[PDB]
Amino acid sequence: SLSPMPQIAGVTYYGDIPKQPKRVVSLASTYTGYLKKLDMNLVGVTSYDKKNPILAKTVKKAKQVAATDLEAITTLKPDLIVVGSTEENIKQLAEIAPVISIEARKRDYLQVLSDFGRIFNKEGKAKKWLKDWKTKTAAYEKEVKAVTGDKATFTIMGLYEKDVYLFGKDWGRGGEIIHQAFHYDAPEKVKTEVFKQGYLSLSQEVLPDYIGDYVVIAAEDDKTGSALYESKLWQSIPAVKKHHVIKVNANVFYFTDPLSLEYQLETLREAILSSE
Ligand SMILES: O=C1CCC(=O)N(O)C/C=C\CCNC(=O)CCC(=O)N(O)CCCCCNC(=O)CCC(=O)N(O)CCCCCN1
Ligand SMILES: [Fe+3]
């Protein structure tokens, strides 16, 4: 029995996708949690998946694999491999098992779930989650905007090693919830320089120019942000002086999947409400 394999923008099939795969290898942390949400049995997952404190609990049995670990992936005997479209070795992966390749941003973070529901005939489960999400986020939006005001601007940022990044509405780090689910505006330069591009690496000195009312900042640990937070440049930013900086744990906040997002939603709601 094969998947109906619908034509979906950004989804490429290699081989005959099983309708009911029993041994799924996920090589893209974007998708792992969607597969889990739809009760797919994962036997391989990524390093990020293992470090995500929400998701990791659900995939303890899975082996940590990278896309280059062809031998380990083969040994796992998958009947389905799920990958991002930018992976360079799709040919060799497809020799191991059927592959679903997904190109980020062709479908939104919600569509991806209903898309997998169609691929695997789990539409009911997908629809129910999406319904509750849309109802909950609509209510939560009203609550948070009652504190911030409706026109408050948010910037999504992330700290990685010595680097500083801004993110748009659809590159994780809380952007889906802040920009899409809560319909928060962003500063002008964020909308014109970051949103379409997905992300932007930036030098410290111009950071003030991209921050308005609030900032959500992702990092994997406390030490990464240390120097920045103590800098005069940083302390000069109005949002910082007003205590409108929401620091979040990247280990879960990198992610976009339903399981991660459930946790991120409560965290962001609570953080914004307590900013008052
Ligand atoms: O899908 C998302 C949000 C968007 C995202 O980050 N992606 O990687 C998916 C879309 C791009 C796939 C193509 N891969 C790359 O461009 C490699 C670099 C990359 O992953 N990026 O996100 C580019 C900007 C961040 C670079 C610094 N690295 C990290 O922050 C590690 C977390 C990091 O960026 N990762 O991707 C690892 C955890 C990802 C969890 C799921 N999150
Ligand atoms: Fe990434």
Domain ranges of the chain: 11-122, 130-274
> Any bridge partners for residue 49, and if so which?
none
Question: In whole angstroms, what is the distance from residue 3 CA to residue 165 CA?
Answer: 39
Instruction: Give the experimental resolution in Å.
Output: 1.9
What is the helix (H) or strand (E) element at residue 214, kind and residue range? strand 214-219
Instruction: Tokens for 135, please give them.
Output: 């109802």
Total Cβ atoms within 10 A of residue 72: 14
> How many residues appear in the chain?
276
Question: In whole angstroms, what is the distance from residue 136 CA to residue 101 CA?
Answer: 31
User: For residue 103, which ligand has an atom nearest its CA?
Assistant: 1
Q: Provide the angle, in degrees to the nearest 10, between the axes of the packed helices 111-120 and 123-148.
A: 170
128 SS3 class: helix
**Helix count (H) and strand count (E) of the chain?**
13, 11
**CA atoms in the 13 A half-sphere facing the CB of 266:** 7
Instruction: Tokens for 91, please give them.
Output: 């040919």
Instruction: Tokens for 46, please give them.
Output: 């990524």
Give the domain 11-122 fold: Rossmann fold (3.40.50)
CA dihedral over 161, 246, 251, 94, signed as positive or negative? negative
Q: To 10 degrees, the CA torsion angle through 241, 224, 26, 52? A: -70
Residue with the two structure tokens 């900013």 = 275
Determine the residue of 27, 30, 163 to mutate for testing ligand 1's pocket, defined as the one with the most ligand atoms within 8 A of the Cβ atom. 30
242 SS3 class: coil
Residue with the two structure tokens 């303890």 = 60
Residue type, 215: V
Total Cβ atoms within 10 A of residue 187: 19
Instruction: Tokens for 79, please give them.
Output: 């009947």
Instruction: Tell me whether domains 11-122 and 130-274 share a fold.
Output: yes
Question: In whole angstroms, what is the distance from residue 200 CA to residue 118 CA?
Answer: 34
State whether the beta carbon of 121 lies less than 6 angstroms from ligand 1.
no
Pairing of strands 214-219, 245-249: parallel
Residue with the two structure tokens 């109005």 = 238
Question: In whole angstroms, what is the distance from residue 26 CA to residue 81 CA?
Answer: 6
Residue with the two structure tokens 């899975």 = 62
CA dihedral over 192, 196, 197, 200, signed as positive or negative? positive
Task: Judge contact between 30 and 257, C-beta under 8 A.
Answer: yes
Binding site feature residues: 16, 71, 88, 95, 141, 163, 183, 220, 230, 243-244, 276
State whether the beta carbon of 210 lies less than 6 angstroms from ligand 1.
no
Question: In whole angstroms, what is the distance from residue 104 CA to residue 82 CA?
Answer: 13
Q: To 10 degrees, the CA torsion angle through 205, 211, 214, 217? A: -50
Residue type, 149: G
CA 55 to ligand 2 centroid distance, Å: 17
Instruction: Tokens for 102, please give them.
Output: 């997904």
Task: Judge contact between 237 and 194, C-beta under 8 A.
Answer: no
CATH number of 130-274: 3.40.50.1980
Question: In whole angstroms, what is the distance from residue 240 CA to residue 162 CA?
Answer: 20
Q: To 10 degrees, the CA torsion angle through 241, 202, 249, 191? A: 80
> Is 45 exposed, middle or buried, given 0-12, 13-18 or 19+ CB atoms closer than 10 A?
buried
Q: Any residues with CB less than 8 A from the CB of 135 and at least 6 apart, and which?
A: none
User: Which residue's C-alpha comes closest to atom 28 of ligand 1?
Assistant: 160
State whether the beta carbon of 109 lies less than 6 angstroms from ligand 1.
no
Closest CA to 210 of 191, 223, 228: 191
